[PDB]
């Protein structure tokens, strides 16, 4: 889904993922939990309403 491509110089990145229309999908969904699967099987992210 989301691919990160970095230069040969960059070795540390800290990303902030934000769900902006979560107030909209609240009118449609009862529970929504997004799990962001990291590089090699790690799971580093969790997003909910």
């Amino acid at each position: 889904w989301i691919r990160v491509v970095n230069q040969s110089d960059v070795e540390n990145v800290k990303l902030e993922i934000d769900w902006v229309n979560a107030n909209q999908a609240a009118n449609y969904f009862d529970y929504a939990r997004i799990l962001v699967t990291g590089p090699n099987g790690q799971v580093k992210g969790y997003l909910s309403l």
């Binding site: 970095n6 230069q7 040969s8 110089d9 960059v10 540390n12």
Partner: protein, 49 residues
């Protein structure tokens, strides 16, 4: 008759031409080639000469 004005002379010269030092410069282009610098990046660059 002749009342010799007893005054003989000796002389010399000194030649100061150059300044002590020559600062030969080879400027650096630090991102260089076959390497890369990114915004917010951290590291070290070195030019030996």
């Amino acid at each position: 008759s002749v009342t010799s004005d007893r005054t003989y002379y000796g002389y010399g010269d000194v030649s100061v031409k150059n300044e002590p030092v020559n600062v030969v410069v080879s400027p650096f282009s630090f991102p260089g080639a076959n390497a890369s610098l990114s915004s917010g990046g951290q590291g070290v660059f070195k030019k030996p000469d």
